[PDB]
Design goal:
Assembly: monomeric
CATH superfamily: Ribosomal protein L30/S12
Oligomer: monomer
PDB class: ribosomal protein
Helix content: 40-55%
Number of domains: 1
Keywords: RNA-binding, thermophilic
Entry title: NMR Structure of Ribosomal Protein L30e from Thermococcus celer
Name: 50S ribosomal protein L30E
Strand content: 15-25%
Length: 102
Amino acid sequence: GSVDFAFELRKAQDTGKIVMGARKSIQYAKMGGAKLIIVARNARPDIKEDIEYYARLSGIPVYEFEGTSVELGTLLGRPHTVSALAVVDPGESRILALGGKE
């Protein structure tokens, strides 16, 4: 009960729509309209700079995951080191609060 990233993220997965991967997420940044896009801090700069820029120009709010892709994969349930995840539809989740306020 303290704007828990994990709770909101799994809740978004349950009562929303979350894209998990890296290249797939870039496509949403390029020409999509995802409410929030999250990228792991320990993700490859090629991936991060590409997504962060593409999303930013599209006006898609990016959030930096406080961890590595391995931890991210473990949290969501992707046993392939998920580099980036797109919170396209958060739903009940207010995870966008972390990546949608400045």
